[PDB]
Amino acid sequence: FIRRQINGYVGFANLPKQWHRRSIKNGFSFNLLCVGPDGIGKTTLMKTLFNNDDIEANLVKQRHKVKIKSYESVIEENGVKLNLNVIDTEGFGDFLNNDQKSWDPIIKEIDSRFDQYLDAENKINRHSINDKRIHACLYFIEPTGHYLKPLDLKFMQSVYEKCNLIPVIAKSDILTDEEILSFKKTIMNQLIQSNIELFKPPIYSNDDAENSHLSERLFSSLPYAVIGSNDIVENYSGNQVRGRSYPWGVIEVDNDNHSDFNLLKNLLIKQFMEELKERTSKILYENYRSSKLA
Amino acid sequence: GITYTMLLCGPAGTGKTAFANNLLETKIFPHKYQYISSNPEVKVIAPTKVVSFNSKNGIPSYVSEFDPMRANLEPGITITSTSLELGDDTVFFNLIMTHGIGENLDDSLCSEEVMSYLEQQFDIVLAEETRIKRNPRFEDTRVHVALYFIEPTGHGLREVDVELMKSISKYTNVLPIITRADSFTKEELTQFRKNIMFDVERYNVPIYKFEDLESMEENQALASLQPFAIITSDTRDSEGRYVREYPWGIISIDDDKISDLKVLKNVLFGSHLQEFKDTTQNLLYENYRSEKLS
Amino acid sequence: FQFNIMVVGQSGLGKSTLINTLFASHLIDSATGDDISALPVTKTTEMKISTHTLVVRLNINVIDTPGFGDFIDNSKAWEPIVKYIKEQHSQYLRKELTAQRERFITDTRVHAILYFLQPNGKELSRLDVEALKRLTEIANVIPVIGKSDTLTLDERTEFRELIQNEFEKYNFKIYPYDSEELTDEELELNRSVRSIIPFAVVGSENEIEINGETFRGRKTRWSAINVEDINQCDFVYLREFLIRTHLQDLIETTSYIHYEGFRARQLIAL
Amino acid sequence: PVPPPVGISNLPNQRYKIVNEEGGTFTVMLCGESGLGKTTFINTLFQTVLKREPIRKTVEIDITRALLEEKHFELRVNVIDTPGFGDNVNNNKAWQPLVDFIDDQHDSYMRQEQQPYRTKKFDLRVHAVLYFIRPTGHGLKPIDIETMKRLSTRANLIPVIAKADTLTAQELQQFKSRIRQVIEAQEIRIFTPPLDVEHARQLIEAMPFAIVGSEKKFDNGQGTQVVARKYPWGLVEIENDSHCDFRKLRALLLRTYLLDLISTTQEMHYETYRRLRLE
C-alpha cells in the first residue's frame, strides 16, 4: 500500500459514523463476571452500576464447589440498548478448603463460553452467534487493609489470561484514606510480583489530553476503592443522594471524594466497555483458541 | 442513372442507423427494438431485405422487439440491403448494413460472413461477364464504399476493428469513422485520431487514401481529417433542425466546427462517388478475377 | 491477679487494635501486618503469647492465633487453639493433683476468647461453626463483630439477630452464663449484655480532632467515629463487661465450669 | 440527576473511536471493456491519481494498492482491474479470471481463518464490483449478462453506465429501463442498500448509475472550479445530480453504505462460498 495525497474531501472518513449508526440500530451486549466472598456486596454494586434493583431478578439456567448464578437484563438509555449478562459466584472462599477444585466452576464457565463460540465458529452451516464470552471479571478484595490473601492470588493468576481482570477493594467506606493508599500499594506490588496482568485502558491517536489523562488515571488507581448503594439517603446538607447513612457519616456513591466508583463505572461502561469486549475477542479468545488448536 | 452501393459496418451502438436516417433526411431504418420516405428526393424501390445471415437455432432476428428473457442469446451476424432512388443525375443507391457485430462472444463469424457476401457479389459479376448471352445492364451488387464505425473508446483500434477493416479492404474502399464524436473533447478527439492512425499503420489496415495538382488543398484536407469524426442525429427540434439535446447543451448537427459529417457526405455522394466505384470495379474486382483465372 | 485473653479471627479484623484500645496501651502488634509472608510458614494456626502488667496489679496474658482462616486450607485451623486451651486445663489439673501442691498455682487457663466474626451479614461459615462448636465447651467465648463500622444500625441489628439465632440453632454456650446462684439484678445485667452480643466493636489506637475536641477514634474523607461513644459502637460496653463487671466471673466460670468439665472427662477416662 | 445515568448512550461513540483507530479496508473491482472511463472514474472518486502491444489481449487481473487518509481516518484501498476483458474478437470465457480471483480471495480468507495462529490477516475479498456498460443506448449484451450473472453470486454487483454524457436524458432513461428489465428477467442479484430510507430509495431508483468522470476542473460560471467535462456546447458537472449519478454512487460506495458493502461481502457472499466449499 502506497500513501497517496487526496485533494479535497472524498468521504471515506464516514466509515466510523456508519459503524456508530449501525451500532445504535443493533444493540450492544456485555458479559460481566463477579468473583468474591458471599456478603462482600457484589449484588449491591451491580444494582448501583446499572441503576437497577432487578439486575439479578432473571436467573437463567454436601456442597464442596462454588455455585455460578447467571442473570440476564436489558438496559435502555437514549435509544441505546445493552443486553447485560451478569455471572455471580456463590460460596467462593466459604469452604474449609478453598483449593482450585472449589473455585474451578468459574474457570469452567469461562472455558465453556469460549468453547461455545469456537464450536459455532467451526460449524459448516455457520450462523450468527450470541457473544457470551466473559468480557470483564470483577474480583472483590476484602477491606482488611493488610494484603491479598493466598486464595486471591491463586484465583487471579488462574483467571488473568482468560478475562480482563479488574480488582476492586469492596466496602472501602470503612478504610481511612491512608489505609486505602497503603492497601492499594501492597496489592499492586503483590500482583506485579505474581505476574498478574490487569486491563490497561487503551489510548487513542488525535485524542483530547483529558481523555488520555483520564485513561492513565483509570489504570493507575487500580484496585478501585468502591462502595455500593442503589438506595437514596439524606446527607447532613439535606440533599437526597445515593449512599449509605451511619451514626458517623453519610457516604455518597456518586461523590468522587468518597470512593473510586465513578472510575469503575468509566472503565466498565462509560468509557471502555467496547475495549474490554475487543480484548476478550481479539486477544484472550484468540490465545485460548490457539492453545486448543495448535 | 448511377448505381452506387455503400456498406455500413461496425459494432452495435455506433450510430449506424442514425447516420443512415440523417444521410437520407428521413427515418427509413428503425432503431433496435423499435421495429416511410418523408423526403421528396428519396424513394424506397426495394425495402430492407436480408442478403446474408449466420445465426444459431431459433435466434431472434435483428427486427425482434425487446425481450429481456431472451437478451442472453447471441444474435449472430445478419446483413441487410435497402435500395432507394435519390433525386441522368438520379442515383440508384443500395445501402448494405450489418447487425450483430460486437454482440457475439466470438465475432469471427462476422468477418467471415462480410467477406462471403462481398466475394459472392464479385463471383456474380464474374459469372455474368463469363456468360455467352450477357446483359450489359445487369444489376451490379458490388459494394463500392464501406464505412467502418469505430466505437468511442478513446484509445485506438481493437482486434475486431482490425479484423473487419482488413477483411473488407480486399473487396472495397474502407473509411474508418470516429462515431459519436460528441463522446470526446477537442483534445481527446485529436488524440483518438492520432492513436487510430498509429494502429492502422502498425497493423497494415488498407484504409482508403485520400489523395491534376489542383486537388492538392481539398484532398489534403480530406486526408488530415482521417478517420472522419462524425456526430449524427435522426431526431429534429421545433425548427425542424437535426440536433442532440443534452441537459448541459444542444448540439446542432449542421454546424461544421463540431463534426466532419458534411465533409463525409460530400466525399460519398459528390467528389469520390465515382472514384470509389472505379477503384472497386476496375482494380479490386480485376485483381480478384486475375487470381481466380490464374 | 492473672487474666488470660485470646483473640480468634482472620488477619486484618482489628484484633490487635481492639486489645490495645481496650487496655489503652500497645500490648500486642498485628501478628501479620501488611505482609503475607508474615503468616505461619507451617500453613496452620500458631499461638502467639505475650505477657504484660497493668494497673489493682493485673497480669494480662494475650494469646493471638495467626493462621486461623488465613490460608487456602483451613480444615484444621481450630485444632491448635483447642490443643492450647486443653493443655492449659491439663497443666492446672496436674498441678492440682500434686501431693506437694503449690500454694499459688500459676493459672495459664484461657479465661476469655474474643471471637471476631466478619461483618458480612451472612450466617456462620463452616470454619466458624466448627471452631465455635469446640471452643464454647472449653472456654468463655465472647463473640464480637470485627470492624462493626461496616454495618449501618439496621444492618447491625439484622446481623446480630441472625448470629443470636445461629447460636440458638447450634446450642452454643455463649458468655455470660446464668446460674441459680445469681440475683435478679445480675440476671437482668446478663440479659442486657447478652442482648448486645456479639458486640459491635470499633477499635483505634490513634486520636482524632472534631470541633477542637480530641477523641479516640477514626477520621476519614467522609466519617468520624468516636470509639468511646456508646451510640456509635459497643466498645465501652465490652470494656465494662471484660475489665469491670465480669472479669472475676470470667476467671470464676473458667475454673468452675470449663476446667471442671475437662477434669471430670479426663478422670472418667483414666 | 438521582441516580446519575449509566454510560450506555456512550457505547456507540466508543465503537466509533475503535473504528477510527483500526482504520478500514475497501476492495473494488472495475470490470469492463477498455475505454469505458474506469481509470478516470477511480481517480475522480478518490480525488487522487491511483492508476496512471499485441492486438489480442489476455484477460488478466491487475491490483493497485493505496493508502488514503482523511480526517485522521486511514483507508487501505485495493483497486482490481480487468485488462483484456471483452477487448478481442473472441471473448468467450473472459469472465473466468475475474470470478476465479473473487473465489480465490474467499477461499484464501477461509483457510486463513482455520489456522491455529491467525493474527495477521491478508483480507482481499472484493467488497464491490463495478460493471461498466458501454452506452450503446440499446441494452445489455450477452457478455454483459453472462459476466454479471456469474459475478452477482460471489460479490456485490453494481452495474453502471459508462460515459453517460454520451446519451441524452431520454436515451439514458430508456437504456436504464432496459438494463433493469434484463437484470430482473435474468435473475441477476445486484447490491441494493438496506431500507430501514427515502435517500436509499432514490439511490435504488437511479440504478444502473449513470457515470461521468473527469480529473479536470472548470469554471461553473459562479467563479468556482468544479470537476467537469468541457465540451464546446456545455459543461458536464460530475457533482451535478441532473448530469450524472456519480454523487449517488459515491454515497453507495464510501459516504453512506461502505460498511453495508463490507458486511454483506463477509456475511453473505463469503459465508455462502465457505458453506458450499466445506459441504
Ligand SMILES: Nc1nc2c(ncn2[C@@H]2O[C@H](COP(=O)(O)OP(=O)(O)O)[C@@H](O)[C@H]2O)c(=O)[nH]1
Ligand atoms: N459496608 C458496606 N456494606 C455494603 C456495601 N455494599 C453492600 N453492602 C451490604 O453488605 C451486605 C451484603 O451485600 P450483598 O449485595 O447481599 O452481597 P453479595 O452476597 O456479595 O451479593 C448487605 O447488607 C448490603 O447492604 C458497601 O459498599 N459497604
Ligand SMILES: Nc1nc2c(ncn2[C@@H]2O[C@H](COP(=O)(O)OP(=O)(O)O)[C@@H](O)[C@H]2O)c(=O)[nH]1
Ligand atoms: N452520443 C451520440 N449518440 C448518438 C449519435 N448518433 C446516434 N446516437 C444515439 O446513440 C444510440 C446509437 O444507436 P443507433 O443509432 O441505432 O446505432 P447502431 O446500433 O450502431 O445502428 C441511440 O440511442 C442514438 O439515439 C451520435 O452522434 N452521438
Ligand SMILES: Nc1nc2c(ncn2[C@@H]2O[C@H](COP(=O)(O)OP(=O)(O)O)[C@@H](O)[C@H]2O)c(=O)[nH]1
Ligand atoms: N474500619 C475499621 N478499621 C479498623 C478497626 N480496627 C482496626 N482497623 C484497621 O484495620 C486494619 C486491621 O489491622 P489490625 O488492627 O492490625 O488487625 P489484626 O491483624 O486483626 O490484629 C488496620 O489498618 C487498622 O488500622 C475497626 O474497628 N474499624
Ligand SMILES: Nc1nc2c(ncn2[C@@H]2O[C@H](COP(=O)(O)OP(=O)(O)O)[C@@H](O)[C@H]2O)c(=O)[nH]1
Ligand atoms: N465522454 C466521456 N469520456 C470519458 C469519461 N471518462 C473518461 N473519458 C475519456 O474517455 C477515455 C477513457 O479512458 P480511460 O479513463 O483510461 O478508460 P478505461 O480504459 O476504461 O480505464 C479517455 O480519453 C478519457 O479522458 C466520461 O465519463 N465520458
Ligand SMILES: [Mg+2]
Ligand atoms: Mg448477592
